[PDB]
Design a protein around this nucleic acid. Structure first.
Lengths: 25, 170
RNA sequence: AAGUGUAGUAUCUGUUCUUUUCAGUGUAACAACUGAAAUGACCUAGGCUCAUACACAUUUUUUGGCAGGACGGGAAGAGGAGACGUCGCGACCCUCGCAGAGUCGUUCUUGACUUGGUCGCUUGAUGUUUCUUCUUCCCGUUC
């Protein structure tokens, strides 16, 4: 329908070490 | 609000107790071929999507004014019309083999309004009008008997030849 | 008047960047690198979740089978009616009440064991089975 022819700190949180899975028991 | 096929497709459809068959009518409102109860049916219509498989029609507790607009239904034997406001009956009803009609608690006023019931050929055996103003009018029973002798049981009372003859006398 | 080479350093700027996992290397842990790849369904981030020979030889299906006009009621008047059954309208009648029924073991619900009938129709409805329509009036459909 309508195919007519014409005519955020991603590496920064890894670098800083955040957004990495961890747990306190 | 209106009785439309979209409603025809999906009511609680099952078999009567009596094993009478049917397929009911409820997308959001009024029903057919089983339990046409309590959804404010103004005018009967769109019976065609019933497409015939129904023995019974429990119209009770709607706001029906008259009984017309019946497509040809060979299978329909019983109509349970109770608790509506039926003022009049169509006349060319003639759904062949309509054996039972339940007009209980409606608003049919005149004897003459009952006339169209005579059209029911020899099938309308059971008719119940109890709960209507017409019942109070004089010689109501005898006039129903002389008008529609096809009835075998009226108001759950059985006709009897005695009042048949009295109906003939008047 | 300007000017070279060896090693090495710092600092801009440009540019790159995850669809999700798993396992290995690697790392202080990361990072980074190396390999593969689920698809489907359901419930309110989550899942002890799930899945990838015969039917023709006696009891059944290959057989004992074949032979203004018309219509439709209901009534009247003139020249459809007997059995024999089987299920209904009424009732002067019968009868008089909550429970497939009746008992027990164990537990909050199951396993065992026993064993309308009658009279009318005052013109109710129906399949054997033998014999021998017209006219008039009313009410519906069709043209």
């Amino acid at each position: 329908e309508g195919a007519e022819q014409v005519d955020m700190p991603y590496w920064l949180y890894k670098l800083h070490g955040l957004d990495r899975e961890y747990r306190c028991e | 609000m209106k009785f439309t096929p979209s409603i025809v497709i999906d009511a609680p459809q099952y078999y009567v107790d009596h094993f009478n068959g049917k397929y009911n009518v409820d997308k959001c409102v009024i029903l057919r071929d089983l339990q046409l109860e309590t959804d404010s049916e103004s005018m009967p219509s769109s019976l065609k999507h019933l497409t015939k498989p129904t023995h019974i029609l429990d119209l009770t507790n709607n706001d029906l004014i008259m009984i017309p607009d019946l497509s040809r239904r060979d299978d329909i034997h019983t109509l349970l019309l109770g608790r509506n406001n039926i003022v009049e009956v169509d006349g060319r009803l003639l759904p062949m083999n309509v054996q039972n009609l339940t007009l209980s608690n409606n608003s049919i006023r005149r004897f003459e309004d009952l006339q169209r019931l005579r059209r029911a050929p020899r099938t309308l055996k059971n008719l119940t009008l109890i709960g209507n103003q017409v019942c109070h009018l004089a010689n109501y029973r005898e006039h129903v008997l002389r008008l529609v002798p096809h009835l075998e049981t009226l108001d759950f009372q059985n006709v009897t030849a005695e009042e048949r003859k009295s109906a003939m006398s008047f």
